[PDB]
Design a protein around this nucleic acid. Structure first.
Ligand SMILES: NCCSC[C@H]1O[C@@H](n2cnc3c(N)ncnc32)[C@H](O)[C@@H]1O
Length: 393
DNA sequence: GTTCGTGTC
DNA sequence: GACACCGAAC
């Protein structure tokens, strides 16, 4: 619920409004962005803050305060400038997710937002809402998690931004103390088109932006930090996804409902493996991390691919490629499981060595930095491997 | 069928 | 700060 002063200062340096313009801080609490903007650019604007919690709303006389759910709020008139730090979190059951609303409210959210996809996130909804509240040519400056650059849940959001105007993304990374989030600033303007990607560096003003790459024809594709070397490697090889079907492991409740699964070791039973069992180039078949055991030979009932040795790639070891050949064909409750496409003939050991290579680790760290704590399917399917006869590049 | 985000030390 | 969710969500 806080933004560091130098993140505020950076964002205000990116903000613009015509004089007499309408300036809005959604989820405002005491209105730090309104205050910072007014300090920097003076008093000749109309300042509005929207806050859902009356005990949090605390603005000076010069700002209009509104007590409402920003996501359901409909002003009479659109805005010249919208800035701030929206709330984040998945709306769902408290046992698993942090954002708790009545089902009727979540239904209203899904109705209001065309970018709502999968579990989605409050911050996605705040972005779509803000764009919708902009006058043509209006500017939005938000600080949000980096996850929307790459994740499937945000594909509709990226496509929406791409067609609604022009987007600049500035990577900050993990700049909130005591908060484990890699953050970006988004500067969007409701006009023109394209994407500009910027790095940043800490400075006495706060952050200095460094232009990284421009994508004038951006249509909502995943956003990555490309370099000469990442580009060269990709074109030198072919995508891993063109050689393999990529599946995910059966999930924990699938195992818990299977008649042969037990919560205890026993004769003829094998541990159900998790990501903690997967190592670079080998599998630990000994230690049980799942709390579940089953007859090895019945695993194929959950997914057919459990029946034979195959390549397993890690999902939750950060931005890394950690791969092994599961020669025993054990049951897995986690990770990616890669099955060769028709007529593909490879050497498991060669491919494993390549995927685990220092070169491959550097490749993914460059493109995807710390946006998310996973190697995702979208990243995995693009990993460059040797070109194979029958599908070159 | 598979996605996504603090918890631990 | 490295290494992990795991199951409610669609
Ligand atoms: N802008 C700082 C971080 S977001 C935290 C703040 O947003 C508020 N908030 C959470 N959800 C909101 C919503 N849907 N509409 C308006 N304010 C909201 C909280 O009350 C809190 O003050």
């Amino acid at each position: 619920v806080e933004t560091p002063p130098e993140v505020v200062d950076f964002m205000v340096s990116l903000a613009e409004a015509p004089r007499g313009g309408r300036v809005l801080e959604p989820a405002c609490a005491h209105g730090p962005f309104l205050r910072a903007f007014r300090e920097a650019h003076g008093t000749a604007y109309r300042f509005v803050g929207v806050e859902i919690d009356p005990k949090a709303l605390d603005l000076p006389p010069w700002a209009e305060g509104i007590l409402a759910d920003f996501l359901l709020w409909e002003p009479g008139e659109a805005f010249d400038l919208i800035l701030g730090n929206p709330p984040y979190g998945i709306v769902g059951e408290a046992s698993k997710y942090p954002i708790h609303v009545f089902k009727a409210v979540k239904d209203l959210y899904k109705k209001a937002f065309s970018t709502w996809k999968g579990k989605y996130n409050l911050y996605g909804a705040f972005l779509e809402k803000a764009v919708r509240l902009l006058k043509p040519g209006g500017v939005l400056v938000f600080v949000v998690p980096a996850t929307w650059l790459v994740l499937e849940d945000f594909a509709l959001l990226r496509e929406f931004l791409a067609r609604e105007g022009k987007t600049s993304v500035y990577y900050l990374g993990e700049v909130f103390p005591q908060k484990k989030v890699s953050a970006v600033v988004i500067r969007f303007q409701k006009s023109g088109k394209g994407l500009s990607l910027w790095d940043t560096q800490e400075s006495e003003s706060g952050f200095t932006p460094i232009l990284w790459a421009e994508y004038p024809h951006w249509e909502g594709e995943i956003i990555r930090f490309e370099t000469e070397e990442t580009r060269k490697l990709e074109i030198s090889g072919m995508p891993l996804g063109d050689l393999f079907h990529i599946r995910f492991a059966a999930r924990s409740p699938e195992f818990k409902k299977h008649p042969a699964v037990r919560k205890e070791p026993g004769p003829g039973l094998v541990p159900v493996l998790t990501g903690r069992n997967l190592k670079p180039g080998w599998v630990d078949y000994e230690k049980n991390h799942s709390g579940l055991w089953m007859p090895k030979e019945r695993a194929k009932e959950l997914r057919d691919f459990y029946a034979t040795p195959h390549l397993v790639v890690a999902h939750t070891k950060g931005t890394r490629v950690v791969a092994a050949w599961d020669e025993r064909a054990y049951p897995w409750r986690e990770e990616f499981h890669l099955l060769p496409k028709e007529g593909v003939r490879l050497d498991p050991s060669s491919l494993v060595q390549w995927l685990n290579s220092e070169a491959m680790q550097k490749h993914v760290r460059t493109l995807y930095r710390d946006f998310v704590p996973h190697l995702t399917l979208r990243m995995l399917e693009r990993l460059p491997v040797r070109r194979e006869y029958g599908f070159h590049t």
